[PDB]
Amino acid sequence: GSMEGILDFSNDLDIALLDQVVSTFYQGSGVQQKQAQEILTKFQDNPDAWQKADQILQFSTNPQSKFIALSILDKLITRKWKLLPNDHRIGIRNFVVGMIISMCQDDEVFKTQKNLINKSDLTLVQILKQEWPQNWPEFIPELIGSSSSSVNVCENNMIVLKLLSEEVFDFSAEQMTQAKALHLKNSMSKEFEQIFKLCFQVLEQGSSSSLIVATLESLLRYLHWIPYRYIYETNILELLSTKFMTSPDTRAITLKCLTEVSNLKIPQDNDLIKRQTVLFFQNTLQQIATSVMPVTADLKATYANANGNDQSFLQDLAMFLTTYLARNRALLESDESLRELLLNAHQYLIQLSKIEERELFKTTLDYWHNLVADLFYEPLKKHIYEEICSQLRLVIIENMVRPEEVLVVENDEGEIVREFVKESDTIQLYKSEREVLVYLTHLNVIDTEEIMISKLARQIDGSEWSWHNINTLSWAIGSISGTMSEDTEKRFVVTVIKDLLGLCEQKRGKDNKAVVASDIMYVVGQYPRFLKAHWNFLRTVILKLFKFMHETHEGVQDMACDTFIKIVQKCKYHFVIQQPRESEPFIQTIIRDIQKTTADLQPQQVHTFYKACGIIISEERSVAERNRLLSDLMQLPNMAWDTIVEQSTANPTLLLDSETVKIIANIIKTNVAVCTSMGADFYPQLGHIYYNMLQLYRAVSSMISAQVAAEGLIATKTPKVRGLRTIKKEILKLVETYISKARNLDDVVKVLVEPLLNAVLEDYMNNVPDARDAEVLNCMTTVVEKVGHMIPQGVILILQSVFECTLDMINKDFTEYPEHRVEFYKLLKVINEKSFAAFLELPPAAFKLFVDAICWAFKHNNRDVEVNGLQIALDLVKNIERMGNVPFANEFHKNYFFIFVSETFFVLTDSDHKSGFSKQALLLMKLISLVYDNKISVPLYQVPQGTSNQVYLSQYLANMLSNAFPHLTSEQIASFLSALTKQCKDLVVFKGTLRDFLVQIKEVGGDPTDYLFA
Amino acid sequence: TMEEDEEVLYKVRAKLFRFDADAKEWKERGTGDCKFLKNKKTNKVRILMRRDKTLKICANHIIAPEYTLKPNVGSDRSWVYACTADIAEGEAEAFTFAIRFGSKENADKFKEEFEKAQEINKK
Amino acid sequence: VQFKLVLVGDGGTGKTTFVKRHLTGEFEKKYVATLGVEVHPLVFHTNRGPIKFNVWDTAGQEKFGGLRDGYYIQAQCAIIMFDVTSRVTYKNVPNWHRDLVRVCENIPIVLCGNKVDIKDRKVKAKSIVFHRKKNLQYYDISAKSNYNFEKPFLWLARKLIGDPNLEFVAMPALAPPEVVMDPALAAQYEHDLEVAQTTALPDEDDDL
Ligand SMILES: Nc1nc2c(ncn2[C@@H]2O[C@H](COP(=O)(O)OP(=O)(O)NP(=O)(O)O)[C@@H](O)[C@H]2O)c(=O)[nH]1
Ligand SMILES: [Mg+2]
Structure with a gap:
């Protein structure tokens, strides 16, 4: 249409047409809304649009139009105020102040146009930030004086003061200079004595709601910075904790003020201030118990019903109780007349901790952490909270969330599947719960064991059988690992594991058997200290893990392999030695049946198994016996490697067979998996394949370039070339893994480095950009990191082969080849760090x-x-x-x-x-x-x-x-x-x-x- | 729900793409269960697919016998085909769909079922 | 039954990608900064009827801020977005909140930490506490992996309708029409099709 006419500033501004463009934007839709959007932005961004704000505030019949006019003034005041002449600055000040007073004294506008007045107050505060007080020293006296002429003007003056306090004390760090923020802070601090008079008078005498709420909202801002005497040396604490807690229209903002008072580090030597701090807490809790809810109320059900502001009030109550008690609860712990108050407050928190709300649970759990950690060290305090802590054990045990290790989860359709994404928020919440429950266990091991032993009994006899109930209980049992002593823990876990071993082979079903399998696996993986001292148990455990590696559910198979590693990382000594009543070291038994045990595991889980065996084998420090254990383990991959190397020295096409690519890559993946857990001990196995592997790397590299020449760049997307590049990436990953952990650096430089650079450097340099593997750069970084100081000419060669060609890939935009950018500058960092001479040779x-x-x-x-x-x-x-x-x-x-x-x-x-x-x-x-x-x-x-x-x-x-x-x-x-x-x-x-x-x-x-x- | 008069013939997790011919790139349209629904009254089989959490439809069209499945250059677990009438987003539009599965085994089983359902609608 | 939703946050935090994921199901990998605002309607089917969100996807970059806080007028709910891989975007959450609630004094607001799918997380869960005092709902989300991607709208719908038991329900599946291909262009259903056939699908290293 013709909405663009307002962007023509030569003729007078059509106020009516402006009001239509605004109405089209906010109330319209589609193209006309987008058309009006770009026009309004251009109109607002015009440097001269502020001169038209005077007439928009007068002649417009649209509040949103006046809002945008103020935004145009806001940009002027915030960025170009000091360039105007002195007459424009006074002129703008007067008609902003005039409009505000005009809108307040019209009672109907004061109710209907709250947004436009709030925008005007903020705009006035932008003028204050520029002019006050060095050019308006009478503002606060005039503001106080005008408060008595009208109640609307008074309520709006509280909004102005609130906004001013926010802009000077809460949002000045990143928006003003240090000198300006200090200037406006001192200016408000100088005049606050007269501001508190108006605030306290309005709070003491009080009209109706609206003016009180605006006054309390402004007080919440003052409490950030004002001196303590305004809070404790007046009656305002008695007003907040009693009068303003009764009426629900001031209860929320009063509770937030009292939370701010509770956060101050009061002079911990003044018996008077301690008395007032106890007093307002006693009054607040009395007002809640008589006017809102009694201590026995089901806050879980109240919060779930979500009537009115119940959820926000319970959130603010949790924040009030935790803030106050984390700082001042000691004031209640000694005097016996304050005991019931101390415990009724914590009983409210117990009830608040039963609400189903993650973020609200984290808030109350953060305080429980504060409490039980104090009861752990501070003498003579535990007994006060014995009943609170006993209730807290029930709550946490019944609300445990799923830890990392549990890979099985119930699906949206009710099926027990394997988790696909890791829930970082759930993981952190479990660790916070464990930390509190561990403390609670130390505080009373007997109570903790009885709760867990009783809940397990009602899980074993189906009285309370439930997936949720068996999971939370098992996760709670595993989390308190290390809190009991041996013998005491021995008693406990033998009991728990047996009933779990029972329940496992009692419940039939694809879902049920998988829920108990994960609970068994989590509990057992958390108690290695017990598994060490009981080989008969460890061997039984390990054989059950193998039995789970034959289940259909991938999650049970995956967790069995992860639990295997977790147990082995701590108990590997009991696999290498000849256990009593055994024919051989258990590692030798695992290695022999490694084909049968891993017969149903997918490749990446077979590799995890081999990495677990590598952890065991590295425990053996007899060089001859370990190198033989290493050879025994790698038999199957080496046997398959010899085959794809015997028949590959002739007939180069065998590599191109898709099934052979998958076999080759899995062989190298197994070598990476073992080399990860063995590090420098992997050298005998690496040398057995090293020279052939680098030839395979050359053979794969030529085939890749042949495909790109025959098919185009699109070949790099095909499954064939993607499979060949995997062999290159896994080969580089294996070499990088070893060199990063190698101790014999002389062997690395003399044996590994020179064939590596010959096989990868010119191949990377002379491939087309889309065929270059960023893993080459990552591998060279580990070379320069670990042996860079021993190959000054190798570092020069590395630079020449990758520097210029990789820089050209990443210097046209900021997003192409993202993995190359990261690995590129990591390489330049280590070269500039450990081999700077190479840049002098450039x-x-x-x-x-x-x-x-x-x-x-x-x-x-x-x-x-x-x-x-x-x-x-x-x-x-x-x-x-x-x-x-x-x-x-x-x-x-x-x-x-x-x-x-x-x-x-x-x-x-x-x-x-x-x-x-x-x-x-x-x-x-x-x-x-x-x-x-x-x-x-x-x-x-x-x-x-x-x-x-x-x-x-x-x-x-x-x-x-x-x-x-x-x-x-x-x-x-x-x-x-x-x-x-x-x-x-x-x-x-x-x-x-x-x-x-x-x-x-x-x-x-x-x-x-x-x-x-x- | 408009599904009680239908029987599920095949179910498989999958990711569905539509081809934006203008930008010459594939754009995702949904991830969830792909179902073959045979109407118990008219015996015609359709594809119905809903996104996981929102359960919004991302595929809703008859498995017409005139459709043919073709491989994608960078996948051994995907199928490409044209669709002249899909009503997932409202009025019947024409689309060039691509659907990817968790494994080549699932992708071959899908093509077997996709063609089996085509013989049903050919009567 | 429609509700205006403003979406605010620092640039690059994923506001547009999150909305596009709900509109079309796609994941946009490019970063094309929003200019001012883009309004998209978004309908969800519930057990209490359909609910429509008029989503005002505002610009995070200051140079493209447009009308800025003027977009918030008459908003009935809001989403504040930050990026868990960028501490700066979380330090600006109090600023976006401040501008927002000065215009919208009493609305439901969700705080969203996006990009939780990235391994190197910078804003850890332990430090995300700004929502507690401000009565905001918080969710770890990822527009890429779709983690909790529906929970912002599910929480807002419950607060806007006033029914805490509100659930998303399967939209009805109308009977699809039987249509034969067009032999007038079936000889040309092999150009735009062979193109698509030779344009590789993205993220072939995913599980789906
Ligand atoms: N890894 C990951 N990237 C994401 C995610 N969400 C968005 N992104 C990416 O972040 C970048 C920014 O995209 P965008 O949605 O436009 O962010 P924005 O906040 O709307 N930018 P602006 O405020 O300037 O309009 C994109 O590249 C996008 O792919 C996510 O969940 N995970
Ligand atoms: Mg955007």
Whole structure:
């Protein structure tokens, strides 16, 4: 249509047409709403739109239009106020104040246009932040004086004061300079004595609700910062804890105020203040017990019904009780007349802890952690909470959530399946529950065991049989592992495991047998100390795990393999020795039947089994016996490896068979799995396959390039090429795994390195970009990390083969080849760290690209790239400084010092790299400190001769910042650089000066004296 | 629910894609149970597929005998085919679907069942 | 029965991807910054009838903020989004909340920590406590893995309808029509089809 006419500012603004575009946006839909959206944004973004705000506030009949007008003024006041002449600033102030008073005195507008008035109050506060009090010292006296003329004006004055307190004390850290925030903080602190009078009077005498609620809402903000005497040396605590708790329309905001009072670290030596802190808590709990609910109420059912504000009130009550008791409960623990209050409050928390609400449970659980940890150490306190803790044991045992190890879960259709995603929130909640229950067990082991032994009895006889009930109980049993002593724990677990061994072979069903299998496996995996001292049990356990590896359910199979590793990581000594009443070490029995045991396991679970055997075999430290145990274990993969190597030296096509690719990759995956658990002990097995594996790597590499030439780049997506590249990735992963754990570095350099680089480097360099495996870069990083100091020519070769070609892949955008970006800068980091000489061997053009690569990593929003890039620049500067006064170091500063200084200033100030501010500040401070410590023994310019680098640096940065931020006065830039220079050894203050600069570049007229804050 | 007059002939977990020919890329449309539903009255079999948690329909069309399953270049566990009338998003639209399964075994079993259901609608 | 929903958060936190996942079922991998706001209707079928969310997907980047807090007017529920792999986006949650509730004093609000599918998590669960004092509901979510992706709307629908027992139900499956292909273009159902046949499916290393 013709809605764009309002964007023409030559003619008068059609107020009516504006009101239609606004109504089309908010109330419309589809294209006309999107059309009106782009028009309203353009109208709002016009630098002259604020001059039309006067007539929009007068002649418009649409509240949303007046809202947008205020947003246009808000941008003016926040960013360009100090550029207007003195008459415009007074003019805008007057008609904002005039409109506010106008809307308050009209009683009907005061009720119907709450949004427009709130937007006006916030806008007025933006003027206060610019003008008050140095140009409006009578604001608070006038505001207090106008409060008595009208009750609407008074209620709105509480909103203005609330907003002002928020902007000065709660949201000023990142929006004002340090000097400005300190200025407005002192200004409000000076005038608060007269603000509390108005607040207390309105609270003492009180009209009806609305004005009280707005007053209490403003008080909640004052409690963040005002002195304690305003709270304890007046009657306001008696008003909050009694009067404003009775009426439900002020109960919520009063409860939030009392929570804020409860959070203060009161003078712990004043018997009077302790008396008032006990008093308002006693009054609050009495008001709840008589006006809201008694201590015996089913808050779980109250919260589930969700009537009115019940859920928010119970949330705020939980927050009030935990905040107060975590800080002041000692005030109640000694006096015997305060005991019932102390226990009724905790009984409310017990009832609150039965609500089905994850986040609310975490809140009350956080306090229970605070309590039981104190009862664990503080003498003579446990007995006070004996009945509270006993109830708490029931609650936590019945609300245990599923730990990591349990891979079986009930599905949305009621079937017990295997979990596909890991629930990080559930895992953390289980650990928090375990931490509390472990403390609760220490506080009374007898009570804990009886609850668990009684619940298990009613699980065994079907009286309370339930998937939920057998799971929570079993997870609670495993979580308290380590709290009982041996013999005491011996008694306990033999009992538990037996009934679980029973229940397992009593309940028939695909689902039931899988629920008990996971509970058995979790409990048993949590008690290795018991399994160590009972080989007969451990062997029975291990054989049940093998029996679970033959079940149909993949989750039971997976957990059996994970439980096997978990047990073996702690009990591996009992597998290598000849146990009494045994024919051989149990590892020898496992290795022999390894084909039968793993007959039904999928490949990635067979590999986990082999990794578990590798943990056992590494316990044996007899070199001959272990290397033989290693050979016995790898028989099947080596036998299959010899076959696909005997018939592969001839007939190269065998590798191309899809089934053979899957077999080859699983063989290498088994070698990776074992090498992970054995580390440096894997060397005998690695050498048995190493030279053949690298030829296989060459054979696979040629086939890959042949496919891409025959089929195109699309070949890299096919299952065939994807399968071949897996062999390359698994080969690199195996070599990287070993070298990362190798102890015999001489063997690595003399035997492993030279065939590795020959097989991977030119293959990576001469493949097309889409065929390059980022795992090559990852492998070279481990080489340079572990033996980089022993192969200075290998590091040079690594650079030449990957540096330029990988940099070209990742320097056109920020998202193509994401795994290459991460591994690329990880490699450049370790080379620049442990083998910096390789960069000295780069041609000056290739060193220019190196600096370009570092700064390119600055501008990444990817934290994996951004962090490494700032670390490389920091280490490069240190590497250059350690060289001293040589041509390369002097050439470096001449060519690159100001490139690093300016590229660091760019990402500091572009508002798009806030996540790396700390490391950016650290880099800029190191660069500035170089000049002001005379560590650069050459001139940085090509300015009259004899001038210092200190002087040129200041002239350079002042000129740089002047052109980049032209709206800054010369003295703003001068004072900022002066402070930034004096502070280049004090990172905290240096970062404070930078943050003050980032505030000032967002507005006009920043005070240059702000940089003298320190 | 409009499913009681139907019998389930085949069920399998799958991921469904639609081809955005403009951008020349595959876009996901849903993950959940793919079902072959034979109407007990008219004996015509349809594909009905709902997204996991929301249970919103992402596939709803007759397994017409004129449809043919073709492999995708980068998958051995997927099938591609055109659909001239799917009503998952309302009015009958035309789509080029792709459906992926957890394994090649599931993908072959699907093609067996997909063709078995085609012979049913051919009467 | 429709309700206005504003969606706010820092740029890149996944606001648009989360909505697109609910509209079409897709997962957008590109980051195309939102300009101002985009309004999309979103209907859910419940046991209390259909509910419609007019989702105002606002812009997180300041330079594209558009009308900014002007989008919040007459909103009836809200979602605050941050990214668990970016601590900065969680430190800005109090700012998005502050602007939001100054316009919408009493609405249901969900706080969402997105991208929980990424292994290297920066905002750990132990430090996410801002919602407690502010009466916000919190969910770990992932638009990529779909973890808890329906729970924001399920909680909001229960709070907006006033029925804590509200559940999503299967939308009815109308009978699909019988239609034969078009032999006028069936000779051309082999260009746009062979194209799709040779365009590889994404994320072939997933379980589905
Ligand atoms: N790994 C992962 N990535 C996600 C997830 N959700 C969104 N993303 C990704 O985050 C990036 C940002 O996408 P987008 O949805 O537009 O975020 P936004 O908050 O709407 N940006 P803006 O506020 O500027 O409009 C995308 O690349 C997207 O793929 C997620 O759950 N997991
Ligand atoms: Mg967006």
